[model samples]
Target: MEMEKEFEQIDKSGSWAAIYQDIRHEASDFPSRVAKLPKNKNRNRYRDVSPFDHSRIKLHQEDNDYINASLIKMEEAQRSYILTQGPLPNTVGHFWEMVWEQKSRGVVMLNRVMEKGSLKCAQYWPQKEEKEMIFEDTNLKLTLISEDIKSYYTVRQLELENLTTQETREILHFHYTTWPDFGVPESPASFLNFLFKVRESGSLSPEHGPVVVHCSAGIGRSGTFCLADTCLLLMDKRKDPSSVDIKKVLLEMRKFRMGLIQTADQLRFSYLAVIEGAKFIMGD
Candidate 1:
């Protein structure tokens, strides 16, 4: 009954519009700290998509190459991931630079190449049909080793090689080929299966570096995935679904990057997804 009331209260007054208003208030309350930082604005994919420099992921600073990326760490859930915008035409090399520098085991892409009438994200990695591609600016080469195609998502085995030393490392690409931009998946079951597929690979494990997660702007769908996973992990750890407060968790995640859980629809979906995921987490 208490959980029911809390969720009902959230629907009555804590809808996405209300949460977004709070987000805007918080964003305005803080000074634009990253705006004054050097070279960040230029590195941004969109004019308005600059990362909060304090938590932004900085590369080794090779030449003028820079990318819009941030590291989101949830210590309580024992999860961390690199949250970043979709790669632009010119930032592909820098994208590879961050992947190499972070030594990430995999990348979780939530959006497809095109959504509706707009280009949501680019195909940053090599297409399976092509086998391989090279990033000249960063001297990185990526080769597709194998592909596991699913109805809604595809997992690709890739080899990331450094041209400088010819060092090669294994990488995984978990692409959700059907996720609609700014919208929820068809249901939590399919989403959870896809998430479990990623988890089964042990890429999101703390033993490895932070996994990379991105959407168009790297917040809406990315935030939903991170939020749902975090809530589920917390529930699994505590062994109680009610112990995790969805709103509070979303707020905590936003501190790492501005404007997480970008819409009320997405926010509402996270609640549904978390509630369902907790059951599976407990059962598994």
Candidate 2:
């Protein structure tokens, strides 16, 4: 139980406050990466967010200056997730490029169509009942076949097609709409239920493309979701989750993306959520 006590201590240790600068310290070739921030098409698009060069996801499909996305691969867990900023009005093409190029089967939209009076992300999907929507820039067509709307989330079955290739793919969009901007859900149960729904769809499996997780900044709510999910997976696998250092796992994940699990509250929430979810999985 000492490890349990240690996990509690680390969560409350105020260690995370200094982590950003520490990650900044751990960063390599920082100036060049930040300098590339201006490379993205829309100047005001970034919301002051750009990918860290080390973890930044590259686009081989086309020539572009910057893509605010990162390929977060956790090899040990056999999971590859694409953590990305929300799709800007201008970047919708690039967003689909990342999705299509990565062969992604699902998108996890954590933010809403509009957040706090600012246009957080373009409504990338076609109107649910409209049957389909097309992206003019990318020449990709998305058709909505099925939709299930829950109180806090919506499960949509989308068909992503490449006009050029004449090939199509089914994509699941798990959009969680209720989580606040900088905080977490009212309970881990809500999030856990959503996680299982995505899991049951087999979207997060290795056979498919990485699940794209996005929020306003791609780091706050996005990071928190990933951290909790990764930790819960580990907790279920090991007899002693106490052996897993939640902070170390998060930092390892952060190396793949600039910031994950943004707030101390989120970091703490990850710990508590894992513990609670572990009880459910372990009980089985």
Candidate 3:
């Protein structure tokens, strides 16, 4: 009852329009200095979407450590997600290096390689026939060992190896291929189903460094996924379904990266997914 009432109240008031304005007002100006540096201009896929320097991921490089990614850590939920843009062709090596350096156990890719007849993200993973891809810049190799294709998503098992160090680790890639371009999923239930599948793999647990989550711009769809997951986890901890404030949590997330939950529709879907996900936590 309590959980549903809050959304209902918002619906009666102004729905997402009012709340999105509030969020925009609160997160109006966060410094994204590094992304704007003269040398780092080509690294960003979008001119507007830039990671804040303070929370941006730092690659272990001597000359430069610039990658368009941010580390969003929520200590209370024991969750840390590295939200980033879909790698540009040039930054693909840096993308893998970030994962290798950060010790991330899994990657939750939220967009397709191509969307709406346009190239949205680079094909960072290797095709089955290609067998493997080696990044000389990072001295890392990624091998596609196996894949499981579901109705709306696919999970690929990848072997990441450091050629120099002769060290290797298994990485899980959770790719949701059905999200609408620049919009929300068709249904919250479908999105939650995919979310729990990733949850089941235990890759999202805090025991690992952080799970890498990304989409085209790394904010809209990516933000929606993290927002829903974090809110549901908080509700489970409190054991009070209504206690979680979706807006407040999103504001907290924006501090790490700018313009999370990009569209009003994405924000609405976040709330819908969280409300639906709480039922599973409540066991009701």
Candidate 4:
């Protein structure tokens, strides 16, 4: 009930109004003829908790010795995929430098935006002129598929180099959106539709690897997306949809990623999204 109330407040306060309005206008006016649907009510419930999990997805501390020690433990071990949030950091650049120093199997830099004349701001990571690539759209499906070399789609820019066959086929994209305090209710179906497109396009490829996502400091929006995704997956596996504890699921995800759904506002929005998703799946 508190979640539902929060969702209502968000809609009434116009938190996401501008975003919805812009999307609506763009869909109608864009040459691509993409139709934007109205937002709807969706929510997920999770109990509040203290203390958070802030484990880095990969590369704890600056030392490769830790990684080396981990590697030594298993003869057939493979390097874990790295997922970074927000903008690239000096440490990240240094880490890649080490990777290159070790003659690693190429580095893939996935980012939200790459503007011209901004290379200086980007740490001047030597752009492999011959191997650089770029994606035209930030949509999840297209972004993910661009990773596959064999795919029919091709990008205009390619900035990174030495991509392995496997790495070349793995594309990552970051996305961000804001909801005004007052606007239409959120729709889980639309979100699902977006994800379905990615999966159907065969870009999601292997179901095992991580798809690094971040909004700002890898919290808030990033956390909400991860939480929503996990809850949705669990809901899918349940025989009785109503039996699923959406709140519990959300809490579990937060434990894995700190500051997830950082604000009460986001947590509330997430609740509505999950609710809508359940209804959509159940044909209610």
lDDT of 1 by residue, 201-270 (tens): 9999978899999988888888888988888888778755676787778878877887787777787788
- On residues 135-206, what C-alpha lDDT tens digit does candidate 3 reach at each position? 888889999999999998999999999998899999999999888765666679889999999999988986
Error of 4 at 215 (Å): 1.4
Worst 10 residues of 3 by lDDT: 1-10
Best by TM-score: 3
Model 1 stretches with alpha carbons more than 4 Å out: 1-5, 9-16, 23-42, 129-131
The C-alpha stretches of model 3 lying farther than 4 A from their native spots are: 12-14
What does the lDDT come to for candidate 3?
0.88
Poorest stretch of ten by lDDT in candidate 4: 67-76
lDDT of 2 by residue, 7-123 (tens): 566666866556444544553333326425456547225555667676677766545646788778886667778888888778787788778888888899888988777788888
Q: After superposition, how far is residue 83 of candidate 3 from its true place, in Å?
A: 0.3
RMSD of 4: 15.3
Q: Residue 7, candidate 4: how far off, in angstroms? A: 7.4
Alpha-carbon TM-score of each model against the true structure: 0.89, 0.87, 0.96, 0.49
**Number of clashing residue pairs in every model?**
0, 0, 0, 28
Candidate 2: TM-score? 0.87
Model 1 lDDT on a 0 to 1 scale: 0.79
Candidates 2 and 3 compared: the better one by lDDT is 3
Error of 4 at 281 (Å): 2.3
